[PDB]
């Protein structure tokens, strides 16, 4: 809406495009930079006790 030049220069971050630096608000630290609980808090609390939350990997 503000122009093709505006759209192009707003989406450009680095002058050097060889390097990939994906944007992160923060970087994962625990569990060797990984997420142990890929769920919501209710899901975690109930899945530790209630069946049906775990859909398995097979």
């Amino acid at each position: 809406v503000h122009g093709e030049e505006y759209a192009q220069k707003m989406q450009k971050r680095f002058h050097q495009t060889d390097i990939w630096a994906p944007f992160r608000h923060r970087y994962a630290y625990m569990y060797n930079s990984s997420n142990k609980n890929v769920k919501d808090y209710k899901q975690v609390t109930l899945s530790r006790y209630i069946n049906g939350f775990d859909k398995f990997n097979v």
Binding site: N32, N35, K36, V38, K39, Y49
Partner: protein, 93 residues
């Protein structure tokens, strides 16, 4: 002929009722813990930190795809709740 127990054996055996009741209660507690862990997973889920990094990535990849990738790829501007009770980010910032 008197085939009675040895006296040291008798003396140490007047504690075995307490030993047996302790074993019953402890087995019950451990079995209940085992079943509480077992029922949701239909198995004993090995702990996440007890796995290699590739194993950790493979275990939770399906959860990532089902809980974050599908909502993000099928997202519409009117799908988000008007309140602030949205889905928390995977990495809380």
């Amino acid at each position: 002929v008197n085939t009675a127990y040895p006296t040291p054996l008798k003396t140490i055996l007047k504690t075995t009722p307490a030993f047996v009741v302790y074993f019953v209660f402890g087995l019950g507690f451990s079995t209940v813990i085992y079943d509480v862990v077992y029922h949701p997973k239909d198995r004993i889920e090995r702990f996440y930190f007890r796995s290699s990094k590739f194993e950790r990535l493979s275990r939770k990849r399906d959860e990532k795809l089902r809980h974050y990738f599908k909502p993000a790829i099928e997202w519409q501007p009117w799908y988000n709740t008007s309140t602030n009770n949205n889905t928390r980010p995977l990495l809380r910032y």
